[PDB]
Subunit: 383 residues, 2 copies
């Protein structure tokens, strides 16, 4: 009995734990890494209340009864030079000329733009009510002291790394990349395309390099154990992989002889013969089928191991073509998404890699669905 | 006054040229690199006719009379082990057991699944007709000889690199990374918040590292020229050296000025001239200027295709915009919903952290009401 996808994904992921180990990596090599913990700032940015404009630091309260025909008069007791601090305080009926960046003087809770008042000698005139906090960049308006600026599980981008430099963090704590073993199997398989190779019925090996890239794309460090022949004794070095690594992936007698399996034979299509047990992922050998198995299983296991958040994008799209679907089978459907439209790539059928190249995304159709019509809106996952 | 955004983008990109230098990198470090040229296959893939299923290579016409009440007997003369080819030929009344991937033996024209027949001794029994070619992955059904399998300007992904390995390419020709000088001006800049200057109002310099990550994300190699003082060392000491050592140069805040003062908001004082990009000093303005200008220039330099993704979302809030200004508004996209990131300030960084996309509003628009369907660009 093929086990449904959602049951298989739960059995698999419940077996997988978040790796504990962390390490400090420099800002220059931090992009794409997963934060091990919350990052809390020990600094206010900006560190003090600043004038957002060249103006006069006043009391907002003093101008509440200000109109065009009732000008409130204030007296300018000081003008703070560039990069200085006000020596005098602000009391009722007073004002202190400041520049942008200048610390708001004691007493003041607002700043009025220079041009919005009439400068007659040592007096200024305000014609409209000024709000409390007007033109003040308050302390910590960017980030406040003791505030979480980046959550655990965040996948760092350039703007995140810049915030880290703003907080004075030279080397940021991130999760250690899960080591993922890769064993290819098949006496059929060969490293290079050649004439004599084709005459002896050999096909070029492709899943190794594809899985290396896919593991590196999703938080892991791939470790190659190479292509092996169909030989029980030599495949028993899967034990070396389980010791050396957190999880291990192997490509296509029987597979229960090497692994104690939670499941084997699943509902997905392609990728039906997928199984898993003891950190070992049994994969299908044909590129299209390995890709679907990676996105539906491996991708989510790796994300759980580093606690990755927001590691995939779901997009709403109008479906271009009909997708008829088998009941009892969870369809992995390759999509090329452009201009809000999901165009279905249909192909085969011998691990024919070109459909992977022409696709942008995938759509998942549950077992209880007979398919979708063109015009129906669908949710897809970007590669 | 202000040069419109679409006109200023066209002026910048017309001045930018595709770099012609190429480079052969191993498949192991090929992902993310941009293809210098088309890549044509020299072999059919699959290279030979193979079985698409575990079963028995037969002649199809032996089974034409096969009914459930008229089983036809074929004799298994050989069982091919995985990786080998048949030593024997399929003729009338004969079958050769094959696994998936096995080369189709001489004489056979179809493969019946093992599930469909019954095995008793050295004999199978076919209860149903099979057509010629059934369950056979024919030569070149994936890719034919001489076909372009990968396009010029493809940003390589794990599956593309897979195709390269299948083609026998050990080192793939990709564009050399465009070198991008980065010069930071500003007298109030400090390097870290623990310095005494921070409490007086000196600003921690974050635009350098943000631009390094931004350049590397979009095809380039960043070259640092550091924070330079207010002197002769700015104009054509560091700037001339940077123009000779790099293809383009970014400078946050002379050049023969193509334009200056554009209509985008934020990032109005953006300008470009002979490969040099005069950019803002505010992180949000620099980020917007990068996405609206520098990203597209890097893409043109390597001929990259499909370097950004545009999706459809529904606005959660209203977005008032002013006429005569091309808006760069940050949003957080999630499951078909576009929430607008509302926080603005003197030079904040947190609003870039809280957003994962941006919406562009043209100059001839007054804004969008909540509930409308806009197009956004993912970071």
């Amino acid at each position: 009995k093929l086990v449904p996808y959602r049951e298989a994904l739960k059995l698999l992921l419940d077996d997988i734990n978040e790796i504990e180990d962390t390490e400090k990596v420099p800002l220059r090599e931090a992009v794409g890494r997963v934060l091990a913990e919350d990052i809390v700032t020990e600094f206010d940015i900006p560190p003090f209340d600043r004038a957002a404009v060249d103006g006069y630091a006043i009391r907002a309260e003093d101008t509440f009864q200000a109109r065009e025909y009732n000008p409130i008069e204030l007296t300018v007791i000081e003008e703070v030079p560039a990069g200085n601090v006000a020596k005098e305080e602000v009391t009722t009926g007073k004002a202190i000329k400041v520049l942008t960046g200048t610390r708001i003087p004691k007493g003041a809770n607002a700043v009025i733009m220079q041009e919005m008042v009439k400068r007659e000698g040592d007096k200024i005139y305000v014609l409209r009510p000024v709000a409390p906090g007007q033109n003040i960049a308050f302390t910590g308006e960017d980030v406040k002291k003791g505030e979480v600026v980046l959550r655990k599980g965040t996948i760092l981008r350039p703007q995140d790394v810049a915030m880290l430099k703003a907080l004075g963090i030279k080397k940021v704590p991130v999760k250690v990349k899960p080591k993922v073993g890769i064993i290819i199997t098949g006496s059929e398989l060969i490293e290079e395309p050649s004439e004599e190779g084709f005459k002896e019925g050999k096909i070029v090996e492709t899943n190794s390099i594809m899985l290396q890239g896919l593991v590196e794309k999703f938080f892991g460090e791939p470790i190659l154990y190479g292509v092996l022949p169909d030989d029980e004794s030599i495949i028993k070095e899967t034990l070396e992989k389980a010791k050396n690594e957190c999880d291990i992936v192997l490509i296509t007698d029987y597979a229960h002889k090497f692994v104690n399996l939670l499941f084997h034979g699943t509902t997905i299509k392609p990728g039906r013969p997928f199984g898993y047990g003891e950190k070992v992922f049994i994969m299908s050998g044909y590129p299209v089928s390995v890709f679907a198995q990676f996105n539906l299983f491996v991708k989510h296991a790796l994300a759980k191991m580093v606690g990755a958040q927001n590691y995939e994008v779901k997009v709403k799209a109008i479906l271009q073509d009909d997708i008829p679907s088998q009941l009892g089978r969870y369809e992995f459907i390759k999509i090329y998404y452009e201009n809000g439209i999901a165009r279905v790539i249909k192909k085969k059928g011998s691990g024919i890699l070109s459909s992977l190249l022409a696709s942008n995304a995938y759509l998942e159709i549950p077992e209880d669905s007979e398919g979708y019509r063109r015009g129906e809106e669908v949710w897809i996952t970007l590669y």
